[PDB]
Design a protein around this ligand. Sequence first.
Ligand SMILES: O=P(O)(O)O[C@@H]1[C@@H](OP(=O)(O)O)[C@H](OP(=O)(O)O)[C@H](O)[C@H](OP(=O)(O)O)[C@H]1OP(=O)(O)O
Ligand SMILES: Nc1ncnc2c1ncn2[C@@H]1O[C@H](COP(=O)(O)OP(=O)(O)O)[C@@H](O)[C@H]1O
Ligand SMILES: [Mg+2]
Ligand SMILES: [Mg+2]
Ligand SMILES: [Zn+2]
Length: 425
Amino acid sequence: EVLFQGPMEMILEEKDASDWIYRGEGGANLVLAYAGSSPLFVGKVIRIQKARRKAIKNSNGVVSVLTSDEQHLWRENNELISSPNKEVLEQRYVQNVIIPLLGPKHVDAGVRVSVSKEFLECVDKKVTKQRPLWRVNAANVDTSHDSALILNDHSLFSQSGGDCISVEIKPKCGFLPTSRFIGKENMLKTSVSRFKMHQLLKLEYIEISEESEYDPLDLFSGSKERVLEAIKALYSTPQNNFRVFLNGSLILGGSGESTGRTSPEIGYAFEDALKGFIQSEDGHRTECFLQLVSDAVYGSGVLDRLLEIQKLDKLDIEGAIHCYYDIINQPCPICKEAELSLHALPLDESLKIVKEYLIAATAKDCSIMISFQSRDYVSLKPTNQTFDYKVHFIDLSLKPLKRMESYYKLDKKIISFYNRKQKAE
Ligand SMILES: O=P(O)(O)O[C@@H]1[C@@H](OP(=O)(O)O)[C@H](OP(=O)(O)O)[C@H](O)[C@H](OP(=O)(O)O)[C@H]1OP(=O)(O)O
Ligand SMILES: Nc1ncnc2c1ncn2[C@@H]1O[C@H](COP(=O)(O)OP(=O)(O)O)[C@@H](O)[C@H]1O
Ligand SMILES: [Mg+2]
Ligand SMILES: [Mg+2]
Ligand SMILES: [Zn+2]
């Protein structure tokens, strides 16, 4: 019998920085994979929030997690609107808003760990050279936070077997709006997907090398032909929607950003990297892997549950924005003759519309990670091997209420540019 220390919350300090290595990042978070051997952390990633190089302050000048409007918008959950920091808040947003709608089979609020400012600084220093320049220009780790999130590394299975092939799909929005509030001049928004139209604008700003062949309407069609077609397009033009890891190591896609089209060189390189994982011929392992990914995604039904959250955007930003201006008690700058009748709604109805809009916005920007190891399972019809797979949602971030205004401007920019390109053509 031996005396053990009492329970104490874990704190990653400056020393521990050498144990984490760059895995990736999106617009809001940096993700590091644990390299050490502590059981606490093997098979985990650490997700560290970035700061855009304007704080939120309460009426006392104190720095705050939610504005008054946000704390009212999300008031239905007491713990949520009481969160002392952005890691708590995101953790409770997932547990108490997303998990009820999505279910917990493929969703994990994660676990908080304490971090010292020096840990955050050394981490930021350590990885800078592996981040994309433009990501570095836009944001670094927010060293003023005292927590981070520990998640499972969906790029491994470990707890058996050997090689693990994992895939990330960022599916974006898989339906077309039908709102009464889309004017006639914008009606192409009802026949052409936001993702398609945004492609054109992305090209104008040199944010992508080429238009994607991917169509979310195929991926969310519930038709296995279209799902596979979508997987094939994602393979051809990954951009920032498709990644593939071998034992946690990028073998297709971009590191923290979009990548350009798959060239025969990049395809040959990939075809080889599947050697031994996909028992198959020589120029055929890719064809089988794409089939594997299509069958796993389709068989899991995760896309259908996700699509129903994305459809909580019932009125489109062009209707939702009017409820926003009522929510924040500002005269509506959109109305200048308009369907307006939104503005006659009771407060709680305007609140529910915007709240549901932001939840939908979470569902439009989340990712899906599918993990594979040779033998839930999928069996290939040609090769006849069985593969174990797990599916996991990542990146269910709560969206800031003030971004409604940014949502509406971007939408205005997108349909307006897309209309012009239809005209001049
Ligand atoms: O607005 P969208 O649809 O372009 O989505 C943004 C994403 O662009 P995408 O079109 O997927 O390349 C954008 O993706 P990248 O930064 O380009 O990877 C971000 O996810 C952004 O969210 P945040 O800045 O992390 O809060 C996303 O912003 P939200 O709309 O999710 O706030
Ligand atoms: N739990 C995880 N397991 C494995 N990889 C992950 C995990 N979470 C994130 N990643 C990788 O890190 C990237 C950034 O994570 P994400 O939460 O999407 O950041 P952001 O919110 O900034 O977009 C992801 O696109 C994914 O490739
Ligand atoms: Mg992301
Ligand atoms: Mg995000
Ligand atoms: Zn209005």
